[PDB]
Design a protein around this ligand. Structure first.
Ligand code: CLA
Ligand code: CLA
Ligand code: CLA
Ligand code: CLA
Ligand code: CLA
Ligand code: CLA
Ligand SMILES: CCCCCCCCCCCCCCCCCC(=O)OC[C@H](CO[C@@H]1O[C@H](CO)[C@H](O)[C@H](O)[C@H]1O)OC(=O)CCCCCCCCCCCCCCCCC
Ligand code: KC2
Ligand code: KC2
Ligand SMILES: CC1=C(C#C/C(C)=C/C=C/C(C)=C/C=C/C=C(C)/C=C/C=C(\C)C#CC2=C(C)C[C@@H](O)CC2(C)C)C(C)(C)C[C@H](O)C1
Ligand SMILES: CC1=C(C#C/C(C)=C/C=C/C(C)=C/C=C/C=C(C)/C=C/C=C(\C)C#CC2=C(C)C[C@@H](O)CC2(C)C)C(C)(C)C[C@H](O)C1
Lengths: 189, 180, 45, 35, 160, 65, 96
């Protein structure tokens, strides 16, 4: 805001979103269309983390699935694997167990709505990372988790879409990089 | 003393500044012999029906659902192609929205019996009608869009019936009426 | 075959007329006391 | 044949709907002992 | 409806647009059209003089509007709509925040990377320049395009 | 006397019983129109009677075709 | 390729269906907790309030203590069987 004004850190032009305060981790203040105003921030935070935690595993997997396949499973481009496993019924097994865990999760969301639990804490810290000795680290880690999650969700999105246009696997695209098919060759007119 | 819209005529008595979209255009004076709340609910409902409909004629031509028979670019032609049962299922779902929205008070005498300023079926998911000044000006917009859409849909329907072409396509490759 | 409807147009009278008359009945029904009565029949009308 | 069929269907549906919604309009209350 | 405070006010509103529409909107609009037109005029002139490295082969000689009809097929235009649209959604938030009471003055997005407006006085002179160049640019762009429609010629070519 | 919607609708049409214009009113106009009607009747009668033969007016069955 | 309760697709649909059911409790509660209800959250329009066709009072509801609906239909019918076109050409004692 070249003219002086009170304003949000991430975007100079817009005012700091109301009810958006530094307290949730990773708050650069960017909620340009308030969603936080329309729905509670804690319910939204639970979503950012859940999507992210799902995404972070997915980014690793799409890359790992390209390089390696468990021997019992066939090696196919990952998007194809979902079709193979869905016929196999492997995906139903992932769906059933993930749903069971989610039902416990849905109860915890209801508690998050009624005070009680902080968004996204399932108290899953089997290892001692951020243990009471390491309790200082939790604030820092929280920031990393949102940041890794925000990035992963963008990255997976990217890997899958880029892969559809290129028809080229993400590791392969890196090492051999080509324009979307036909562009060097094609003339629009 | 004089209508704003039609300077020669007199301001329709019933119309005062209070209803929105009031420039005094009730030359035939329907206002004198019917309830403005009934009339407004209709001005709005026909528009809201033809804001969805007009957008519908344009969208259908560009993009059509994957299911079979949802493939006719011309809206008028599509009505026949789509399965008849589906069209009735839409009828009924809309019919339920009518009864639930109006709370079962669905007639000229009873619809407005409890509150219900005309057109307040309660759909304001993102509260935007909290400022009054804002509400008074948004309400003019809805009516001005409703009134344009009514005229637009009629034009698109009639022009398609002659051309057997969707609105955007007819403008491209326009041909005089004699050709059709 | 269902309801002898071989032409879709037959469904228009079959649905619009019962709805329209229901609309007339809706006004009778809304002008009534629809609270419960604990009796053999409702004398409120 | 279709026009006669649609006219007959319209008439029958109208009369049956009138009968059905008339007997739904608290017909038991239409007795001389009702207060 | 027209008062001295807005920069560039020579008092010229014959058709009385100011009376019906908030000045803050009208101004944000005049600058936004101007900022776009300035870039458009520059581009149309640049395009005739130079083209990016692989561009000529894919598009050939099409220029001005014709290039757009060819560009859309490349999808160069789409990327431009999607990215420009993403900036615009923030811009819609900005107009809304400004129309709601807010600090931002019309046309201020906070882009001053080189700190050129740090002096308060210099900023005012620059603001007048920006409306005036922009008002000129819009007139020019329209002219270049109309010239194109009629002559089928790019503006530098028309000069040639 | 029963009052009905159609009765009230048509009542002004049957309201001015015995209302008359003063004096002779439009009597000369009526007489002039009656004179014109008499002349017209004489013309058509003499055409049918064949005592009046306008050109292209063949009072005959053969004029049918 | 099993079908129905054992079909893979019905199950994916079932999870989508469970989300639709849980949406109303989870997000209505979220909307109930803080939805809108902000002095700072209000709609805005560029058009001036003096612009013609803007109502003095929002959601206006006229009392309309006037002719019953049926009489109005009659007025609308009198449009087509009794318009005032020929009254303008109206012409300008009682025998005893
Ligand atoms: C722990 C409980 C459990 C059990 C009994 C099963 C059972 C099954 N799963 Mg698995 N699964 C589970 C949890 C479980 N799942 C979880 C939590 C996930 C992650 C969300 C998955 C993800 C998954 C996928 C992705 C797939 C399966 C498949 C299968 C089926 C094929 C079995 C197979 O490969 O041959 C027999 C198994 C082997 C030869 C592998 C060696 C197993 C060793 C010998 C047993 C070790 C103990 C065992 C893990 C039990 C753990 C619990 C116990 C300690 C109490 C089978 C019905 C597949 C399927 O649908 O079939 C096509 C498939 O593709 N599952
Ligand atoms: C179904 C459509 C419909 C309905 C119910 C209304 C209802 C109303 N309008 Mg709206 N209006 C409409 C369409 C409609 N309008 C359209 C399409 C336009 C654009 C031309 C307008 C422009 C308009 C203005 C500018 C104003 C109104 C106003 C009003 C109110 C008083 C006038 C009145 O009673 O008219 C009743 C109208 C009808 C019953 C519809 C007419 C039906 C005829 C018989 C056929 C239509 C064809 C027509 C002759 C042209 C074709 C040739 C009332 C709430 C005034 C207001 O806001 O006061 C509160 C006002 O100032 N209207
Ligand atoms: C007056 C409104 C209206 C009417 C009568 C129709 C009628 C029809 N449409 Mg169209 N349509 C409309 C509006 C309308 N549409 C709008 C607004 C859109 C934009 C999303 C579309 C987009 C659309 C597509 C893409 C297709 C149709 C198709 C069809 C046909 C089959 C029905 C179907 O699958 O609908 C599908 C329509 C939708 C899923 C959109 C409905 C969205 C509603 C109208 C808006 C509700 C939003 C509201 C805020 C929610 C309130 C919550 C409470 C049928 C002739 C199909 C066809 O045969 O076309 C050739 C088809 O493929 N419609
Ligand atoms: C089960 C189905 C169902 C039911 C019960 C209702 C119930 C209702 N609707 Mg309907 N509606 C439905 C489905 C349904 N809706 C669907 C699917 C649509 C299309 C999306 C509509 C579109 C619709 C509109 C547009 C309107 C309603 C209205 C109403 C309300 C008044 C009903 C009434 O008295 O009309 C009984 C039926 C009639 C009076 C016949 C219709 C009148 C004709 C068509 C007018 C013709 C005018 C003419 C062409 C112009 C003259 C031209 C000139 C040259 C002479 C009521 C709550 C009205 C309302 O709320 O009013 C305040 C209203 O304006 N509805
Ligand atoms: C679109 C560009 C645009 C816009 C939004 C404005 C807006 C404004 N100008 Mg600027 N101006 C412009 C172009 C523009 N001007 C150009 C090209 C010139 C040079 C000729 C000027 C020269 C100028 C001077 C010298 C002054 C202004 C002033 C003003 C302010 C008050 C004037 C007013 O009420 O009319 C608003 C203007 C319009 C509504 C533009 C109308 C253009 C045509 C007639 C519209 C025709 C309809 C259109 C084609 C429909 C399609 C629209 C569709 C694309 C959406 C206002 C902020 C005054 C000021 O600073 O006050 C504070 C002042 O003194 N202007
Ligand atoms: C309104 C603005 C506008 C629009 C719609 C276009 C549209 C187009 N240009 Mg042009 N262009 C513009 C401005 C514009 N340009 C400007 C300002 C320049 C000078 C750098 C150019 C230089 C230019 C060249 C050299 C070429 C095009 C080409 C094209 C076409 C393909 C897009 C492309 O790759 O361009 C790429 C354009 C750029 C990378 C310029 C972006 C500069 C921005 C505006 C800087 C913004 C300031 C920034 C914040 C500071 C850093 C397309 C028709 C190509 C074509 O098909 O022509 C044959 C081509 O070869 N343009
Ligand atoms: C309450 C009624 C209780 C009835 C008890 C006895 C029922 C006997 C079995 C009835 C089967 C009904 C099936 C659905 C209707 C049907 O298919 O119609 C069957 C026929 C079908 O009609 C024929 O169908 C053919 C099919 O190939 C062709 O399409 C013919 O063109 C078509 O005419 O329709 C009728 O006969 C209607 C008869 C008149 C009904 C009058 C009802 C009067 C009011 C009754 C009480 C209302 C409350
Ligand atoms: C928004 C309005 C709307 C609602 C609220 C709604 C609700 C339900 C529910 C209740 C939850 C069920 C269980 C259900 C089931 C089916 N719907 Mg659906 N439905 C709606 C709209 C349409 C349209 C427009 C079409 C359609 C269809 C089908 C078919 C296919 C039949 C077949 O397989 O051929 C089946 C089984 C198509 C059709 O019937 O074509 C013959 C078609 O065009 N529906 N529908
Ligand atoms: C960032 C500066 C820059 C911009 C903004 C830009 C825009 C466009 C557009 C936009 C409308 C099109 C359509 C287009 C097309 C092609 N570009 Mg180009 N391009 C730019 C830079 C480079 C470089 C550095 C190279 C290059 C090339 C090609 C080839 C190759 C195959 C061919 O020649 O057939 C094709 C088709 C390579 C080359 O071989 O150039 C002879 C190469 O080294 N470009 N380019
Ligand atoms: C914040 C903010 C804003 C914003 C914003 C944005 C930009 C929001 C963007 C959000 C995004 C992009 C969220 C993406 C989530 C992606 C996920 C969860 C991926 C899941 C993948 C899975 C389950 C998988 C998989 C797979 C694996 C792993 C491998 C395969 O073999 C199999 C399979 C395919 C199944 C804006 C201004 C708009 C508004 C606002 O005022 C505030
Ligand atoms: C924000 C932030 C941080 C960050 C960050 C980062 C690093 C964000 C990075 C974001 C990026 C790179 C987003 C990329 C978007 C690319 C898009 C949408 C492309 C769309 C393509 C289209 C529409 C197309 C097309 C088409 C064309 C052209 C023509 C057609 O023939 C073909 C085709 C279909 C392909 C982090 C987490 C570090 C921390 C922090 O807490 C906040």
């Amino acid at each position: 805001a070249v003219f002086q004004g009170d304003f949000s850190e991430s975007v100079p032009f817009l005012k700091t979103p109301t009810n958006l305060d530094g307290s949730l981790p990773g708050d650069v203040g960017f909620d340009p269309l308030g969603f936080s105003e329309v729905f509670d921030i804690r319910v939204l935070r639970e979503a950012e983390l859940k999507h992210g935690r799902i995404a972070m595993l997915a980014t690793l997997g799409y890359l790992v699935q390209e390089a390696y396949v468990f021997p019992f499973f066939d090696k196919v481009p990952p998007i194809q694997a979902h079709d193979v496993l869905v016929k196999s019924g492997g995906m139903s097994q992932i769906l059933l167990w993930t749903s069971f865990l989610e039902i416990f999760g849905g109860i915890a969301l209801f508690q998050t709505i009624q005070g009680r639990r902080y968004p996204g804490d399932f108290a899953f810290d089997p290892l001692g990372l951020s243990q009471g000795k390491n309790a200082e680290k939790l604030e820092r880690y929280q920031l990393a988790e949102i940041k890794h999650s925000r990035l992963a969700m963008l990255a997976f999105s990217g890997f899958v879409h880029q892969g559809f246009i290129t028809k080229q696997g993400v590791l392969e695209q890196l090492g051999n990089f080509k324009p979307i098919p036909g562009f060097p060759e094609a003339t629009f007119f | 003393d004089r209508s704003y819209s039609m300077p020669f005529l007199e301001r329709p008595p019933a119309l005062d500044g209070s209803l929105a979209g009031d420039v005094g255009f009730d030359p035939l004076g329907f206002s004198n012999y019917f309830d403005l709340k009934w009339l407004r609910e209709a001005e709005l409902k026909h528009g809201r029906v033809c804001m969805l409909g007009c957008t519908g004629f344009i969208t259908q031509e560009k993009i059509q659902l994957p299911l079979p028979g949802f493939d006719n670019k011309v809206a008028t032609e599509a009505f026949f192609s789509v399965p008849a049962g589906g069209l009735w299922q839409i009828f009924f779902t809309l019919g339920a929205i009518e009864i639930l929205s109006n709370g079962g008070k669905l007639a000229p005498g009873d619809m407005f019996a409890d509150g219900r300023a005309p057109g307040d079926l309660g759909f304001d998911p993102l509260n935007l009608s909290g400022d009054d000044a804002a509400l008074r000006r948004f309400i003019l917009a809805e009516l001005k869009h409703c009134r344009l859409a009514m005229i637009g849909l009629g034009g698109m329907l009639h022009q398609m019936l002659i051309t057997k072409q969707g609105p955007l396509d007819q403008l491209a490759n326009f041909q005089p009426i004699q050709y059709y | 075959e269902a309801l002898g409807v071989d032409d879709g147009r037959l469904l228009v009278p079959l649905v619009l007329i019962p709805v329209f008359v229901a609309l007339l009945y809706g006004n009778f029904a809304s002008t009534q006391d629809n609270e419960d009565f604990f009796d053999t029949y409702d004398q409120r009308r | 044949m279709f026009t006669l069929k649609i006219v007959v269907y319209t008439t029958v549906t109208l009369f049956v709907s009138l009968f059905t919604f008339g007997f739904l309009s608290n017909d038991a209350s239409r007795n001389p002992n009702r207060k | 409806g027209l008062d001295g405070t807005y920069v560039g006010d020579v008092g010229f509103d014959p058709l009385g647009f100011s009376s019906i529409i908030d000045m803050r909107w009208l101004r944000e609009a005049e600058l936004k059209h101007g900022r776009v037109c300035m870039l458009a005029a520059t581009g149309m002139i640049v395009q005739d003089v130079y083209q990016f490295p692989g561009v000529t082969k894919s598009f050939g000689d099409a220029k001005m509007t014709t290039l757009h009809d060819v560009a859309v097929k490349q999808g160069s235009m789409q990327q431009l709509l999607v990215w420009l649209g993403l900036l615009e959604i923030f811009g819609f938030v900005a107009i809304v925040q400004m129309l709601q009471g807010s600090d931002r003055q019309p046309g201020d997005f906070g882009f001053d990377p080189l700190n050129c407006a740090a002096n308060p006085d210099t900023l005012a002179r620059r603001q007048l320049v920006e409306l005036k160049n922009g008002r000129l640019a819009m007139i020019a762009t329209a002219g270049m395009l109309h010239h194109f429609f009629i002559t089928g010629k790019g503006p530098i070519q028309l000069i040639t | 006397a029963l009052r009905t919607r159609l009765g009230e609708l048509l009542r002004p049409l049957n309201s001015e019983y015995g209302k008359v214009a003063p004096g002779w009113g439009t009597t000369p106009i009526m007489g002039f129109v009656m004179l014109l009607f008499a002349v017209f009747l004489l013309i058509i009668l003499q055409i049918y009677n064949s005592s009046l033969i306008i050109e292209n007016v063949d009072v005959d069955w053969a004029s049918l075709g | 390729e099993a079908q129905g309760f054992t079909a893979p697709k019905n199950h994916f649909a079932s999870v989508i269906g469970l989300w639709v059911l849980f949406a109303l409790p989870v997000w209505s509660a979220a909307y109930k907790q803080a939805g809108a209800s902000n002095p700072e959250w209000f709609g805005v329009s560029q058009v001036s309030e003096d612009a013609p066709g803007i109502g003095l009072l929002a959601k206006a509801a006229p009392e309309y203590n006037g002719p019953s609906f049926r009489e109005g239909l009659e007025y609308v019918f009198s449009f087509v069987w009794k318009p005032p076109i020929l009254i303008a050409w109206k012409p300008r004692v009682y025998d005893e």
